[PDB]
């Protein structure tokens, strides 16, 4: 199937032999009576290779963000980024101050979260790709996870969603009290890639960057 | 001695037994000696216990009442079984002709067993489909690729199909044959080191302690 | 409920709450959401939002020892808040009944928004829109029809 | 000693694509099946089924073996 031939086609190599299943050590070891070195000596390498490689966990990235913290840096962009979307929302300056308190607090509370999970960097880079992407010509694709429920991604124009209008909860995206990754699985319109591909690149190297495989089953 | 045989019917079953509830028409093979026909055909007509298919109709026509006054399979049990018993049988698409045959004599309660125990059953579509893979292998696919005319025969049914059946079959396995012609001794053993001895030990220990179990320590 | 057809109740006739009506308020008394789901166990129990979305993940996995703890907690903390017991785990059996079907509002949302925003252009301008429709999907001869 | 003169060295699972044909979690229950404590795995040229390897070499307490076949030239 792989080489794209029919069993019996004379063209066809045959390499292989009905002998080639697991075999188990007995059964090996009676077919190299005459060899014990060659048994001896599977079990001599394998004790040899020893290979750590830990999984599951993380490495970090960031920012140019001078001699300052990627935390202070974040705390700075997302105050200010806040300020943008509440003079868009109540560019009345009377309702902002009376409907303020309620995004201040949401702010520092998932603010808290976000540095306390050691997330800033990564939140920051994402944010900056996405407002480039909509500078140029680039299409971001509908998907958000649970991302909507987060006022700071709103804010920092990360996300589309006012979740203090539709009481969308932070929680079900990043929580606290579990915890839960950086799965925020964030997407764009592939027709764009090579655009995006090259931004990332110009940001963090070329040989930093690669695209991930799927499958054919 | 080979023997050759191709049975058109009264219709078939597209599903589950093609055989259930059907009954065969008519019975026309030539005999093969050689690779040459003595000439002793054996082509005979019997009786159909039920209608002939709309399909079968079409395929060389055939009236129903035609083989009324025809025998029936129990007539012809013992001649047409000597015929065949104990010599090669090469048909197209075995499973529907044999299917039939076998569901006949089990029909008759006679003890006869199934022709394949007695007889080789041996398929001529299997070879085509070897040496000419993903290509048509169909009777009239094969006619028309070895340029043998089957239509504009005046023989509709068995008899037709037996005779050219011999010739194709004939051709390909005739076709140009080919020539072609198609422990002890000592060995040093590297023992791991003491430092990959440590290293082995380090790793053991990552096994057992994540997962709870190891064989090489048990 | 919503065209008054039927009593609306915050969320079942016996079984229903006041202080459930700005949780519920949006959805008509209706249990729709993921999020309805945490905002209850805040609300009505004292959770917190990290605590909340504890129970919903464990409302999806169904455990037999897992259930019994929170169903604990969910008791104390509606008497807590002075809620009657009885009325707060009846509500709790509705909840992890619906919870089954019960929908992440902002992936929902995130789309839904989309959605409207196709509803309006079309409804404004589909002098362009549809033209820009016709050209996304001018290679499938089926949906250009 | 415990049990061990021999394990198996050279081995596809069906992450090799040009071929293989048992899934990586079946190969690793077989190795164990046979009573092996650990498990050489050489796929044609990759790691496909590496992090599942790892995945459930952690779980059943066997030791993954570092492996992988290729052509040269």
Redesign the interface.
Known sequence: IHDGFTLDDPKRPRNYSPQQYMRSEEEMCELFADIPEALANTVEIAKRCNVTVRLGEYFLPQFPTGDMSTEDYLVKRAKEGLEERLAFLFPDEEERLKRRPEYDERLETELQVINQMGFPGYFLIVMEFIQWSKDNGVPVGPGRGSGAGSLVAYALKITDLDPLEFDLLFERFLNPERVSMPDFDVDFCMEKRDQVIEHVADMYGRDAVSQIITFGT | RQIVLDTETTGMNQIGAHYEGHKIIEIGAVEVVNRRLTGNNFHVYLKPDRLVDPEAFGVHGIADEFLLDKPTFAEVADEFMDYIRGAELVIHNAAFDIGFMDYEFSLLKRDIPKTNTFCKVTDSLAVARKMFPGKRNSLDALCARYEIDNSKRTLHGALLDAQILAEVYLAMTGGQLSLPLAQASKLRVVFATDEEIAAHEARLDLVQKKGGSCLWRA | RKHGREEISYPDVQWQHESLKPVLEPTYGIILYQEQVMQIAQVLSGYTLGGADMLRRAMGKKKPEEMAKQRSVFAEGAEKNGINAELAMKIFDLVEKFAGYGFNKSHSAAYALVSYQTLWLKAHYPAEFMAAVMTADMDNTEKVV | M????????R?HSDYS???GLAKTAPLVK???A?????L?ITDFTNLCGL?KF??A???????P??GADFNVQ
């Open positions: 415990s049990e061990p003169r021999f394990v198996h060295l081995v694509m040009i071929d077989k190795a164990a046979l009573g092996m404590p650990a050489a992090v790892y995945g070499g952690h779980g059943a307490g066997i030791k073996i570092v």
